[PDB]
Amino acid sequence: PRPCQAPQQWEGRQVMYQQSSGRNSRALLSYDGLNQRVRVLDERKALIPCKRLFEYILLYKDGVMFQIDQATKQCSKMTLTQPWDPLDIPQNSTFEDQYSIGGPQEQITVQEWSDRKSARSYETWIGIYTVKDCYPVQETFTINYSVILSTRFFDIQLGIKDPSVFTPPSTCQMAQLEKMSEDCS
Amino acid sequence: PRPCQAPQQWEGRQVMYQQSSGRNSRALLSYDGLNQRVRVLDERKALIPCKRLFEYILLYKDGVMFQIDQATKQCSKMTLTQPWDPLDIPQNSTFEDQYSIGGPQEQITVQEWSDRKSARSYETWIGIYTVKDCYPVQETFTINYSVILSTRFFDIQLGIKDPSVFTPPSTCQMAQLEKMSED
């Protein structure tokens, strides 16, 4: 099996697990592969634990990220140290397995890909994409075999419906220069 | 939305994350909800790192787990602290959400349920099950909102092809009382 080409612009929702917190966080996502930008709007279901809701606009072209309190519109601007890393399967990945989620009438077939050298082979980005359309399902990053971060994607709809979602608000002009906490006060 | 009725007998494969270790492990699974028995055969994926493969047979109606070394069939026999908890949606669970996995023209709709409640929004179990079929997709157990374990399921086939998979090997007749590590 060769790697499919993932769509480069879409919007839906995600659930991100982070080792650093032990927790799952939900958000709306806007992924612009064409423009090497991303926007993440934190979503809440349960009111507890108590946390502040943020909006993130990442603009790898301009080497900057903005983080915006969804309520009060406060804005802190920060550097982009990390290099652009798209949601597609890199051409040299290793095919790991293929499986079916669900059952007859409904099911979906996905493939799992990693970066892993047969001669002492282990996997450090692990991507799950659907077979027919190449939609991203899941992305996991591993250090020394242990999960650091894993994101599930869903409710994917193609394209960016309104690119203004990547336009920071006025409040970012005089933006602060360090990350605002999520902790309830 | 009310809770769908998940099939009580099937076999497939799974991938289980554990917060304790931070790692995922693979296995085949045979789930027999009717007879309260589960069989787990650890699947190897790759060396790196090096760990030994067991098979687990869980016979809840007899209060015991067997752990079997796949390379040697050495058996240890372990009392189950566990009480039986089936892979279904408890009638009284809370509806959390419905969403689509995949994308247009290659999509599957699922529902997320928990034992969380409206007034003091707090969980221990969170299942993901398909809307149409009620197949299991994913289970997470959390404490104080933190992930303890999370299992993803796939290649589900209804029924049990060979119920002798639930029958311990004869070596479990002279079982050890104590457990085997992997290294």
Author numbering:
A (entry chain A): 39 to 223
B (entry chain B): 39 to 221
Q: Mind quoting what the paper says about this structure?
A:
Orthologous proteins to ependymin called ependymin-related proteins (EPDRs) have been found to exist in various tissues from sea urchins to humans, yet their functional role remains to be revealed. All of the EPDR1s fold into a dimer using a monomeric subunit that is mostly made up of two stacking antiparallel β-sheets with a curvature on one side, resulting in the formation of a deep hydrophobic pocket. All six of the cysteine residues in the monomeric subunit participate in the formation of three intramolecular disulfide bonds. The EPDR1 fold is very similar to the folds of bacterial VioE and LolA/LolB, which also use a similar hydrophobic pocket for their respective functions as a hydrophobic substrate-binding enzyme and a lipoprotein carrier, respectively.
Buried surface areas (BSAs) of ∼1900 and ∼200 Å2 (both per subunit from PISA analysis; Krissinel & Henrick, 2007) were created between the subunits. Judging from the sizes of these areas, the smaller interface burying ∼200 Å2 is only a lattice contact, while the dimeric surface burying ∼1900 Å2 is likely to be a crucial interaction mode with physiological relevance. It is interesting to note that we do not see any electron density for any ligand in the same region despite the fact that PEGs were used to crystallize the human and frog EPDR1s.
